[model samples]
Target chain A: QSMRALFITSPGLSHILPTVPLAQALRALGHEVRYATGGDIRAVAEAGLCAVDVSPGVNYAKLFEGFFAEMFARVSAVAVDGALRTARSWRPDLVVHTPTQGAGPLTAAALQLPCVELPLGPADSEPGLGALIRRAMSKDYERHGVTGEPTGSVRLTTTPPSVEALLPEDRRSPGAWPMRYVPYNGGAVLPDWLPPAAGRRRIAVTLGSIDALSGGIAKLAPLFSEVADVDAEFVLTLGGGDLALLGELPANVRVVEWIPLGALLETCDAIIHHGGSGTLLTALAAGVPQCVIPHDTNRDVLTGLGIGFDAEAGSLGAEQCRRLLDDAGLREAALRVRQEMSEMPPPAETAAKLVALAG
Target chain B: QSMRALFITSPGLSHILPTVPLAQALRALGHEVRYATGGDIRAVAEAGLCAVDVSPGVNYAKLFVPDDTGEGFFAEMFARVSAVAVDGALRTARSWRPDLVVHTPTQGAGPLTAAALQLPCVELPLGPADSEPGLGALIRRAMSKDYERHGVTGEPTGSVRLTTTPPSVEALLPEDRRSPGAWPMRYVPYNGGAVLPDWLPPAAGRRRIAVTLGAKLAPLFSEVADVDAEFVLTLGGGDLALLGELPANVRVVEWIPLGALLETCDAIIHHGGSGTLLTALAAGVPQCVIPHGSDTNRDVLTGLGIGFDAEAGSLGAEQCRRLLDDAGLREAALRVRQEMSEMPPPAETAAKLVALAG
Candidate 1:
C-alpha cells in the first residue's frame, strides 16, 4: 500500500529527519513516502530522496547567501513566512516539521491532515529554557487559537528519555505530553554495522547532515582527532556536511559522510561532541552516556548543559577525553531513563493507531 | 567620498541596527558599503544592499539548520568558528577597503584587522559587562590581548574609546572620573526594536522601566501580563521562542528605535549592563536594575534600592518571568535617574579627542 503523504519542511537537514524514518519505514513496509522540503534541495536530491523546492520562482540560494551579512532583510520572518507560504502551495496531507519552522503548524492546519510536529532540535522536543522561549514566540494560534489543544492532531517528539537524566527535567509548565521517542528510520544501509550488545563498551560520534553548511570539519577535526584515538571500539559517522581531514585517523575510527544513525547508536556505549538535540536523542534511544562541547553562540550550550557535559572536548588531552568516555554514572543513568520508554508504544503501534483512527 | 563598505552583523536585528546610522553616514559621504555574512544574509540582501556568501566552498544557509536527530556540537562549533574564520577572510579582501573598521567590539578584539592594516577604530559598545566599573581602562586591557598585543606588536593602533554605553551603565563603571564625557562613540538606539506600547506611561511623565533577560525577555511579560505598572516588556526579537501571548502592558515591535524611547523615559528598569544601562545613561534616563543570578553576577543600579536577583527562583524561567513586577525595580529606576542627571554625555568628549588624535 503506497500511502501518499507530503513531508513539509524548511531547508534544514535535522528538521526533515524525524519524517524520514517513518517515510523510509513506510517504504520498507512497501508503502510510498516522498520527502518534499525547501532550503537544502540539492543535498536532499543528492541523498536520492525526492525534494520539492517550494521557494517558487525565487532563487533561494541567492537569497540565502547573504544569511549573515545582509542586515536589512527580515531573515527570520521571511524564512518563517516563506516556508508557510510554500507549504500552502505543496498542500500535503501529512506534515513533519521542526519548532524553528513557524509555518509548519499553519500549513498542516490548512491541509487538515495529521500534523505530527517532529522535534528536530531539543527546543521543539523537550522543555528547555530555549524550547520554552520558542513556544512563547511560536504561532500555533492559527489552528489552535490562543491556548490549549492545537488545530493539528499531534506532536511527535523524536528523542527518548535516556539523555534527560543527564540534563535537567522541565518542572515548570510540564508542556503538553505529545508522543515522544518515535524511533528515526535513518535511511542507514547496514543492519550489520551495529556491534553486538555483548558489553565491548561502544561509543559513536556523528557530526550530523548539515555539517557541510556549518564548517564541521575545522571545528570537529581537533576534537575528533582525539576521539579516533580512544580505546573503546569507536565510530565517527560524518554527516553529509563538508569537513576537511587533518592528522592520521586512528584504527578505531570510522568516518563516513552518511550512515543510518538509529542502527549505529544501538551499539554505542556513549556519544560525544557539540550538542545536537537529535544526536543527544539518538544516544538516548541507544541508552548511552553523552557529553556536549559548546560554541560561543549558546545553542549547543542550551542543549549541552542538560546532558551534564559542555561541548569542549576538542581542546582536552587524550587522558581527559578518556575520562569523558569513562562516563560511568551518566551511562548508568541513561540506561535507567531509556527503560521508561521500553514499555511505550513502538512506531508500529502508533502507525496502527493512525490507521484505526482513520478507518 | 563615502566608502563602499559592507557592515556584517549577527543575525539578530538589534546588532545590525546600531551600525546602520554609521553606514548611512558613510553612504552620505559617498562610499559604497556591502554586506558579507551568512547567518542573516537575506536580512541585508533584501534590505536593498549587496552581499557575499563569504564561506568560499561551503554553502552558508546550512549554518542555520538544526542538526539531524542525535547529531550534536560539531554543528554549533562549526557554525561560529567557521563564521569567524570567514569574517577574517572577508576583512582581508574588501576593496576600496574600509579606512576605518567600525564595528561592535563583541564580535571579538580589533587587533585581528587593525594589525593587518594599521587603521583607525570606532568600537560600538564596550565589552559585554563590567565589574566594579572603570570600563574605560578595562576595555583597553581586554583589547591588549585580543588585539593590541598579539597583532600590532603590543601597541593599540586605534585610539580605543567606546561609541555608546557610558552614563547609564556608568554605575557599573569604576568610580573615579564618573562623567560620561570620557567615552567616544555616540550613545544611541537599543536596536532591538521599539517596545513602546499604549499601556506605557507617556515618555517623560513617570519613571519608565524596561526589564528583561536579553532576547529571552518576553517570557517575563507573559508571567506579569496582569501586573499593572508604568513599564514596557520587550523580548527584543524573540517571537519565535516565546510560548504564550503577550501582556496588555507589553507591546512586541518587530522594529522601533530604542534610542527614541530611551531618551523619553523618566526612569528605566533593566538587566544591568552595557546595552540598556549605557543606552539609558546616554539618553540621560535613570535606571531601575537587576543583575545576573546575584552572587555569581549581580550589581545593583547605583542610587536605587538593592536589586533582588533571588526572585527569579532557583534561577528558573518560571520564577524569572513572574518576578518582573516588584516595588524594588520601580523605586530603583526613580532613584537611579536622579543620580544620573549629574553626569555629562560620554560621546561628546571622547569623540572630540579621538578625532583630534586622528
Candidate 2:
C-alpha cells in the first residue's frame, strides 16, 4: 500500500540531509513524501523532496542568542497552523521529525498522527541537552495545550552504539531504530583533481559550514599552513570560508571553497577537521583517521575509536598528519570502525523496516 | 536490492513534474535516483531530487516559436535537446553508472545515453500523449551521428515504454506507434509544491468551476467572465486586470494546488495541460478542455469521454452553462476516474523498470 510521509526538521542542512536517503527510499516505494520545516528549503527540495515552510517569521540565526528550544516551540505552533491548513487538502499516513523541530511532534500530537524521530545528531544520546531543550520548550507546549514530553512512535538513531560508545549512550529517549550514517557533503560536481594521486598520503582539512559561520575557520585556516610543509599533499576545503585568510600555501596544497567530502575523503589517508558531527561521521565512513581540533562529543568517539588524535585549533598542523600516516594501529582502528559502519544496514534496508513499522 | 536509476528529462516544469512521483517511488524502494536534464536544476531540485545539468547552454524556450506545428515543436526540441544533452548524459553515465535510464518522451538524448552505456532505457509519458506518429523516426535521423560517436550503431530503440495514462483511454500511442513493451500506470498530479490559497477552502452548496489557461492563450478568463456559476480561475492579482469585467461569483488565485481543488470543483475549463486533465479525471469532475492548436487536448479528453471541447477563443457563459447542467457527462467522468484508479501506480511501474533492466 502507498503511504504519505511528512518529515519535520529544524531548518539545518545536516538535519535535512540525513532524511534524504530515507525520503528517497519511501518515495522509491511510491509513497508521497514532503517536508515541513522552518529552515531553507533548497537543500530539502534539491535533494528531491517537497518542502513547505512551517515557521515563516522565526529566523534562527538572528535569534541564536535566544533559546533554540524557545524558537522551536514557536516553530511548533506555526507548524500546527500550517499543518491544519495543509490537512484541509492533504494528509500523511506517517509523520517523521527531528527532536528539535518542535512543530513536527506537536502537529503529530494534534492530528493524532504516528511519528518517528530521526535525530540529526547526538543530542538525544545525551541527557543534559535534552533536559535543557525540554525546559526551554515547555512554554511552547503550554501555549499549544500540548501536555507532557513529546515522543515518536518510532525513534531513529543514525549513529549506532559503536559510534555512540565513544559519545556514551545516555538512553534518555526511545529505543532507537538503528540506521547507517550515509555521508552527504552536499551534491556537487566531482572535480577533476578529486580522487587524485593515491600515490602520496592525501590529507583533507575541512571545517563544516557551521564551524565556518562561528569563526572557527579563522583559527583553523592558518593551521593548514603548518601542514603545507608536510610530506603529504593537503587539500583544505574552506567550506564557505574566506580564501585570502589562509595566505600562501606550499606547492602540494590545494585550497578549495567546497568539495563533497564523501568523494574527496575516498582517496585520503587521513582527515583533520573541527569535530562537527557531519564531518566526523563522514570521515568515519571513509575509514579516514582524524586529528580533532576544538573538542566536543566527537573527541569522546575519536579517542575511543583509536582513530583520532586530539589537538588545539591553534596547533592543528603537520605533526598530526605525520603521526596519522606513521601509526599502523590508528589506521587499523580506522578501518575497524569503517567496517563496523559498512556492516550496518544501509538506508534502503532500514527503509523497509520503517515501512513495516509505519504500517 | 537497490538500483541506481537516472532520470533524463526535458528542462520544462511540466516535463519534470510528471517524473517526481516515479523518481521518489524509485527512491522510496531503495534505488539511488538522480536527474539529468537540459532544464534548470532548481525545478528538479525543488522537487527534492538531485538534478544535474545535462543539456547545458541550450535554451529550450528560445527554440520554441508558438506558430511551429506540434511536429515542428517536437522535432526542434528533441533534436536540440538530444544534441546538447547526449554528451552530458554520457559523461554522467560514466561517472554515475546508473543501472537504468528513464526519460520524459521529449528528451530524446536519453535513448542515446542508454545505447552508449548499454543500459535499459524507458520513456515515461509527459502527459498521456504520444509524440506525432513517426516523430521518433525523424528525431533518430538527426541523432544517428551522435550515437556513432559513442561507439553505438544504428537506431535507438529504448528498452521499454511506460505510460501514466490508464489502459482504457487507448495507448497514448496507437498500437502501431507504441513499442511492444509499453505499460500503463496511474497518472499522479505533481504541479510542483504549492499550497491552497486562503479563499480556496471547500465551500458547500454551490456548483464550482475551475478555469485554468495554462501557458497558452492565457487571457481566456475574460471570455468566460459572464458565467453565472461560481468560478475559481488560476489567475493571480497581476493577471486579473486584463480580463476587464468579472462577475461577482468569480475568484482569481495565483495558484490552485490542482489535485486537491479538483475534488471541490463540479467541472473544470482548462488549457489542455495533462496535469490538469489527469487531475480532473482522478477527481471525477467533468471537463471543458479548450484546445490551443494541438489535437492532444481534444484527443485525450474526448477519447476518455470525460470532457466537452470548447474553442479556445469561444469559451464563455454558454459553454460553462452546458457543462454545469450535464449530469450524464458528470457520470461518465466518475467512470473515467474509476478506470484510472485501477491502473498501476508509478511505483509499481518503477518496479517494472528495474525488472526490465535486470
True contacts kept of each: 0.00, 0.29
lDDT of 1 by residue, B90-184 (tens): 34333326555544433333334434556655554432242212432344343444343334453336644443433444455446423343343
- What's the count of clashing pairs in each model shown? 71, 26
**What DockQ do the predictions score, one after another?**
0.01, 0.24
lDDT minimum window of 10 residues, candidate 1 chain A: A67-76
lDDT of 2 by residue, B157-231 (tens): 346677766655655446654444468777777665553244555566777898777534434556556665688
lDDT of each residue in A155-175, candidate 2, tens digit only: 777775666765534543446
Off by over 4 Å in 1: A1-5, A23-36, A41-51, A61-96, A108-114, A125-153, A159-177, A180-185, A188-202, A211-215, A219-230, A238-245, A296-308, A324-327, A352-359, B1-358
CAPRI tier for the interface of model 1: incorrect
Judged by DockQ, which candidate is best? 2
